Amino acid sequence: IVGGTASVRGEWPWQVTLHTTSPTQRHLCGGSIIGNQWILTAAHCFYGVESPKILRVYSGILNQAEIAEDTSFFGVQEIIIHDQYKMAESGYDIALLKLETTVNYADSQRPISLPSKGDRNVIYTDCWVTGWGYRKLRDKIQNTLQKAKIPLVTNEECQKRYRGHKITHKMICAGYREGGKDACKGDSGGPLSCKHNEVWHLVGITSWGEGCAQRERPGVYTNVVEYVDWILEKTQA
Ligand SMILES: *[C@](=O)([C]([C][C][C][N]C([N])=[N])[N]C(=O)[C]N1C(=O)C([N][C]C2=[C][C]=[C][C]=[C]2)=[C]N=C1S[C])C1=N[C]=[C]S1
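# 632 complex -> structure
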């Protein structure tokens, strides 16, 4: 995350850090707990990933330093990628990770509610993007989970900033006209939480953008509310 600040421990209990053991263990992407056995993340985060066996999900983490060889984690039983996904910039950048075991909720790890179709009209004014991603290009994974408050921008305005792409209604953008605060490499799959009426909603999933925090280049996110039916279908045993 760029132009962000250190998060408070337990402040984003649905935020998880997704790790890969190949070749050696490291943070791969962010993700969000949406069910006792489900993580919602980005699809493009599984490029080159041929087996869920090399994945490790860590919940209730503030600092990457807390993660050691002993540290407990959640295995991944199945990776579910939207069948229409091709690449982040084309949309459908969403995936579900079915965990091998169930998450026991607590103050440090709990699920975030999904947006309601009737909320597609709601005006989110308190939105935050979080992650251990780059604080700048050519940077590196950060130790402490970062947070940044960023305003949502209309799809019309976003389309103007990406004339080379098609910003669909299945995407949602966020950023400052002057740039300065945004998600970056490593934040992918992360949640774009928006508190409405005392309740936090998973409005978006960190997906892509041109560079990071550049002026007139809003971050682009998967518009989660457009996938509630998909999520229900894929999670209902
Ligand atoms: C993800 O953490 C990053 C997050 C990027 C967020 N960017 C913001 N908010 N400024 N996602 C990606 O790397 C996805 N991605 C891209 O963002 C780009 N950008 C180049 C581009 C896009 C549009 C127009 C011009 C240029 C290119 N490819 C990809 S696919 C990986 C990470 N995911 C994996 C590692 S870090």
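# post-check
The chain is about 5% helix and 30% strand.
The radius of gyration is 16 Å.
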